[PDB]
């Protein structure tokens, strides 16, 4: 006689009151105003703030946090009442409730079994994301021994058939045909995340667990992000996970076996309905946010800007000496190496990719190489770029086999499709890849990144799946000279051992010679020792890391023109550069250096967020290249 879950229904009542009576500081019912928007299609969840829950009613908040799994469909039906009473939605549509701003936090090591079935939030790095699918939630079946339809059987993260046919005189437990049209599904994406690098124990592999994303919180996560998740920890049934027998269910009916049909062996197990109970933790993400959000939300991003950050980046753009200021903020630790500071900053801003009418994809990224004597802050610059920017992947030399370097393949464990696992270039897409010990990359993969640099794209066809993955990343390379030490009496192409096309593709080359000059030596010693003595202070990044990072994200979408005067200056200055080439530089000048100079001029216009590249930018870009290219010093 339809026994009622008293606490869950009281939670439905109190939460319906919360929805229809909690009002913002302005005084209006904020969640009424939010429920207004679920009338639209492609929208079936409200996003209720857990802090609002706490403020309105602490008792209900603790009850939900301690009984989240049992109350969840009840809260969903409370929302269904709250929206159907006002607006005239389709009756069949389902709804969901998404929590965020939860006070407590936990770790993937803390997600122990006691946290099963109750709300919890974690942080993670989204490894990979399987495709969207429709998942069956409530099935309608037909019993193939009396053709009676069994209605609305729940799926507990497994294809569940009705436990017995609803007709009393028919004990069908086997032959059921799913009536697909009558059943209702939920949109569903499975994603894999792993422990953040901060939370690793000693000698520990990063654990990884699978997180299920039900409707409307489905494509929000993406591979490579740093996302906080909030939701239940559930258990999804597993089978044949172990070769040792474990916990097994079976009916408690005391039946025996008659002679010739004795309930032994396979017949016996099928008769009793024996089944192993092997489970696995599978987080059930109710909501997903970036763990380090960029904003509290060019014209669209500008609208997303809050007023304070908007005026901040505005006065940033209006600032003069922003050039050296950005240098200092990016590299407070570094002393000297101003050319590397400038080149790497321009690399972060990037150029403007373009494409011809015929279809030739003109490069827009600008790859930089640092080559020098040992212990000259090369790996340090790459680490600075890594730790600074998002979409800043890092790898070093022979630590990355090609498959993980660019792309790999796996089959969808659920469906027939294949998931194209994202390699370093992909995770660095539309960003930076910092490659260290670039000279010590095998030919088999240095050619791969060369293909990426030529085409901004790699097409993988392997193990039964073909695809054309885009990778518009920019490469910052570190290259040790041959012999360990650079030799200024030799050309660059014989100091290092890169392939000639790779060296051609590389946009900027910086030479860092470890000469022994004692004023500089005093400077460096004072600098680093000052840092170690005064770790926390002794940094004067005039703009905070978040400030300049937001400035980069906002500046990126401005695409400079090239005015006619600047074009005249460009051509005449490249002519002067060729006159220099015509003594000799350690790496000769070609039309690729013209391409490099125009791309750097574009990137300086990008730094100042202009819509026109001016002779100021052109002059500075030429100066950068001219000082980068050095005269080989024969005695």
């Amino acid at each position: 006689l339809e026994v009622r879950d008293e606490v869950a229904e009281k939670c439905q009542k109190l939460f319906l009151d919360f929805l229809e009576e909690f009002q913002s500081s302005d005084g209006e019912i904020k969640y009424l105003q939010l429920a207004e928007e679920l009338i639209r299609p492609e929208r079936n969840t409200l996003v209720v703030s857990f802090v609002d829950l706490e403020q309105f009613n602490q008792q209900l908040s603790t009850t939900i946090q301690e009984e989240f799994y049992r109350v969840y469909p009840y809260l969903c039906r409370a929302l269904k009442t709250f929206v159907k009473d006002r607006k005239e939605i389709p009756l069949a549509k389902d709804f969901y409730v998404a929590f965020q701003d939860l006070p407590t936090r936990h770790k993937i090591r803390e997600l122990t079994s006691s946290r099963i079935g109750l709300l919890t939030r974690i942080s993670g790095q989204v490894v990979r994301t399987h495709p969207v699918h429709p998942e069956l939630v409530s099935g309608t079946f037909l019993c193939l021994d009396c053709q009676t339809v069994i209605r609305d059987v729940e799926q507990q993260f497994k294809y569940t058939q009705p436990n017995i046919c609803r007709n009393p005189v028919c004990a069908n437990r086997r032959r059921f045909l799913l009536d697909t049209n009558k059943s209702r599904f939920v949109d569903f994406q499975k994603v894999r995340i792993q422990e953040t690098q901060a939370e690793l124990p000693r000698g520990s592999i990063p654990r990884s667990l699978e997180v299920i994303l039900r409707a409307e919180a489905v494509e929000s996560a993406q591979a490579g992000d740093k996302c906080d998740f909030t939701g239940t920890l559930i258990v999804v049934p597993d089978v044949s996970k172990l070769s040792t027998p474990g916990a097994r269910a079976e009916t408690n009916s005391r039946v025996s076996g008659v002679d010739g049909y004795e309930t032994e062996g396979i017949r016996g197990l099928r008769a009793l309905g024996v089944r192993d109970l092997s489970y696995r933790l599978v987080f059930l993400a109710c909501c997903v946010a970036p763990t380090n959000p960029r904003f509290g939300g060019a014209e669209s991003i500008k609208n997303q800007m809050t007023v304070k950050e908007w005026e901040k980046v505005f006065e940033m753009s209006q600032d003069k000496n922003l050039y050296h200021n950005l240098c200092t903020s990016l590299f407070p630790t570094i002393h000297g190496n101003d050319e590397v500071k400038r080149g790497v900053l321009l690399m972060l801003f990037g150029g403007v990719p373009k494409t011809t009418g015929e279809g030739t994809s003109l490069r827009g990224d600008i790859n930089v190489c640092i080559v020098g004597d040992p212990s000259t802050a090369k790996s340090q610059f790459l680490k600075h770029v890594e730790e600074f920017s998002p979409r800043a992947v890092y790898t070093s030399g022979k630590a990355s086999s090609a498959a993980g370097l660019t792309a790999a393949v796996v089959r969808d464990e659920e469906s027939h499709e294949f998931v194209i696992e994202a390699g370093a270039l992909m995770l660095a897409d539309n960003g930076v890849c910092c490659i260290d010990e670039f000279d010590k990359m095998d030919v088999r993969d240095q050619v791969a990144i060369h293909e990426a640099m030529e085409q901004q794209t790699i097409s993988i066809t392997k193990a039964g799946v073909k695809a054309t993955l885009n990778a518009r990343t920019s490469i910052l390379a570190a290259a040790n000279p041959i012999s360990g030490h650079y030799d200024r009496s030799k050309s660059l192409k014989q100091n290092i051992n890169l392939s000639a096309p790779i060296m051609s593709r590389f946009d900027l080359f910086f030479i860092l010679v470890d000469e022994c000059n004692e004023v500089t030596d005093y400077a460096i010693a004072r600098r680093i020792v000052d840092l170690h003595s005064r770790i926390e202070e002794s940094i004067d990044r005039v703009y905070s890391l978040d400030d300049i990072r937001r400035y980069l994200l906002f500046a990126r979408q401005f695409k400079p023109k090239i005015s006619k005067e600047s074009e005249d200056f460009i051509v005449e200055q490249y002519k002067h550069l060729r006159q220099r080439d015509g003594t000799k530089s350690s790496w000769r000048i070609t039309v690729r250096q013209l391409e490099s100079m125009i791309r750097l001029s574009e990137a300086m216009a990008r730094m100042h967020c202009c819509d026109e590249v001016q002779p100021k930018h052109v002059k500075e870009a030429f100066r950068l290249l001219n000082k980068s290219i050095i005269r080989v010093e024969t005695p």
């Binding site: 799994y69 099963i116 000693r202 000698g203 070769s243 009916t251 630590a399 990355s400 993980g404 370097l405």
Partner: protein, 637 residues
């Protein structure tokens, strides 16, 4: 009993019927009442006669030992009582035989007894569940391969090295069933490893209407710990041997890979299904251990990071003894001589190894932008195959916690970093870590470092430079931690330091790698006659044959308490030291200085400060750093 429920005990296993036979439990002579009263008697009467105040910390020795433990339990609120099987053996033998031979029932009798005593005392405290005894320090099973099947389901203690720990495995405990007709609910506790499903509703009486609801049933934890036995009695020509451990509930994740542990647990033999799906099982039984107690304490090794982090580890008298040792004048040399007594008069080398054991100051850098900064010391020992560099590496590998050892090209980059393997126990492509990752927060002792081919030597640059490590392959795309300290032992070209060759060519290693290192000791042969005679007498005495404890305590206290910060005098001394080092480095025949060598001087100054328990790095520290970094590399000569 104060309305405090007795908790499930997955470690003991599926409960048996508990049948009683009149002559005890069937086939096992325990006499549950006799066991309970004997255990109460032990728990009050036992005063450890020969014990030490160093061992028992914060415990009034003459007062009842385990009752003071119960008092610690009451004040703290952790319902675990770590009982010692050697204490039990000393007090009475038959009780110990009961515990060793029939743990599966003897444990809940002990828990009943301890709860009886606990609420005989303290009838007002609050506990999250009843008290759980945990025996340990059984008779050490020397070689687990010698475990006959006559020792099945007994209690054993083994010592090993944790190589792997699985993800959390749930374990059903209260199958929560719900009718699909009337929604009536019920709960079935795990009967004997099985869930007797109700098969008929108790309110509408429909048959087979009750469906198991998974994530409304309460669960427990379970983690598969893959350990390799490190016995103290290895027979002839027997390879080493992994073993499987299962740790339940609060014991999960309390041991990380690379941790050498003494695990005390009940032995188990289990069938194995022939296929994954069929129910036939091979007559041969695989075995494993269910784990009651982790013990990360050993006399021959330094205090692990957990014991560093814990506070109540040293008595007041012991910390004061450490303070006056710091006040001793020549403590640096005292500890240096204390290290490795069986090696003769390598005072500079042992001072360097001591500085390595101390480490430096792990400095936070997160908002600086600099990235992680290596706070550890890397040492190279260069010499022909007559010196005792291999002996030093062997000794340090034995003495350290989280030690790993490698020799020559008996390795590879893949097997040093990580690989993907089908675990035989779960049939899953799990990830496994190599030596560099295993010795994460300890020491990696590399031997025959010259014969290390380019692929498997190029990975050491990552470790020595960043303290991180990258494995970007088809297996996983991640970034592990490897904060190890490298203790390398290299040989010159043609296995002899001939005089007519400068140092860098005689060593013949990459110059960038020698820059990575932080001390480089060249064990040339001193031809001195008196040294020759003293060495000879020392070795013959080594045949005709400070304390490790005080050494451990001092080092662990220095790690726990004092993190040195630079003093302005030391900063000026360092700047002067580095410019002087570069000035002598004009002649590049020797190993030229670098800003990396400045950082090495920083770290060695911090290590000397920690030797003094300075808390402030000073000119004395910096000068010793310079002198050591010069005598090492022999830049005078």
């Amino acid at each position: 009993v104060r309305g405090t429920p007795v908790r499930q005990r997955p470690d003991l296993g599926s409960a048996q019927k508990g049948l009683q036979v009149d002559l005890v439990i069937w086939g096992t002579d325990v006499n549950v009442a006799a066991c309970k009263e004997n255990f109460q008697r032990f728990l009050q009467r036992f005063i450890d006669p020969l014990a030490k105040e160093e061992e028992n910390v914060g415990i009034d020795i003459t007062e009842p030992l385990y009752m003071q433990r119960l008092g610690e339990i009451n004040v703290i609120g952790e319902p675990f009582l770590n009982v010692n099987c050697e204490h039990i053996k000393s007090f009475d033998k038959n009780l110990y035989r009961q515990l060793i031979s029939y743990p599966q029932e003897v444990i809940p009798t002990f828990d009943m007894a301890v709860n009886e005593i606990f609420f005989d005392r303290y009838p007002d405290s609050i506990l999250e569940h009843q008290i759980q005894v945990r025996p340990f320090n059984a008779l050490k099973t020397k070689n687990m391969r010698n475990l006959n099947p006559e020792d099945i389901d007994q209690l054993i203690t083994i010592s090993g090295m944790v190589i792997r720990t699985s993800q959390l495995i749930p374990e059903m405990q209260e199958a929560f069933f719900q009718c699909q007709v009337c929604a009536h609910t019920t709960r079935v506790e795990m009967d004997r490893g099985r869930i007797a499903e109700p098969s008929v509703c108790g309110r509408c009486h429909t048959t087979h209407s009750m469906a198991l609801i998974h994530n409304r049933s309460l669960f427990s934890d379970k983690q598969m710990i893959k350990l390799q036995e490190s016995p103290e009695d290895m027979p002839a020509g027997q390879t080493p041997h992994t073993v499987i451990l299962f740790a339940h509930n609060d014991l999960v994740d309390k041991v990380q890979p690379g941790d050498r542990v003494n695990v005390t647990g009940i032995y188990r033999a289990v069938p194995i299904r022939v296929n994954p799906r069929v129910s036939n099982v091979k007559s041969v039984y695989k075995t494993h251990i269910d784990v009651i107690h982790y013990r990360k304490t050993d006399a021959k090794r330094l205090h692990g990071l957990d014991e560093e982090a814990e506070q109540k580890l040293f008595s007041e008298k012991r910390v004061e003894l450490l303070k006056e040792l710091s006040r001793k004048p020549d403590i640096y040399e005292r500890l240096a001589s204390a290290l490795a007594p069986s090696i003769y008069e390598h005072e500079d080398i042992k001072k360097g190894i001591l500085l390595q054991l101390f480490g430096g100051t792990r400095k936070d850098f997160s908002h600086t932008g600099r990235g992680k900064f290596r706070a550890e010391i890397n040492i190279l020992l260069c010499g022909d195959p007559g010196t005792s560099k291999s002996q030093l590496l062997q000794y340090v590998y034995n003495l350290v916690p989280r030690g790993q050892y490698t020799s020559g090209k008996g390795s590879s980059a893949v097997g040093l970093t990580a690989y993907v393997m089908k675990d035989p126990e779960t049939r899953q492509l799990v990830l496994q870590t190599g030596a560099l990752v295993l010795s994460d927060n300890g020491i990696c002792c590399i031997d025959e470092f010259d014969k290390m081919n380019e692929s498997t030597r190029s990975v050491l640059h990552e470790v020595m430079e960043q303290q991180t490590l990258s494995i970007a392959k088809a297996g996983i795309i991640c970034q592990l931690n490897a904060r190890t300290s490298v203790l390398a032992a290299a040989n010159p070209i043609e296995s002899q330091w001939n005089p007519k060759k400068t140092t860098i060519e005689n060593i013949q290693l990459p110059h960038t790698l020698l820059s990575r290192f932080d001390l480089i000791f060249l064990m040339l042969d001193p031809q001195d006659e008196a040294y020759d005679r003293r060495l000879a007498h020392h070795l013959v005495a080594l045949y005709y044959q400070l304390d490790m404890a005080v050494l451990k305590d001092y080092i662990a206290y220095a790690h726990s308490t004092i993190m040195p910060r630079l003093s302005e005098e030391a900063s000026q001394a360092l700047i002067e030291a580095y410019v002087d080092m570069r000035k002598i480095g004009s002649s590049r025949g020797m190993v030229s200085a670098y800003p990396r060598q400045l950082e090495s001087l920083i770290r060695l100054a911090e290590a000397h400060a920690k030797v003094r328990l300075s808390n402030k790095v000073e000119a004395i520290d910096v000068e010793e750093a310079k002198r050591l970094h010069r005598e090492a590399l022999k830049q005078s000569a």
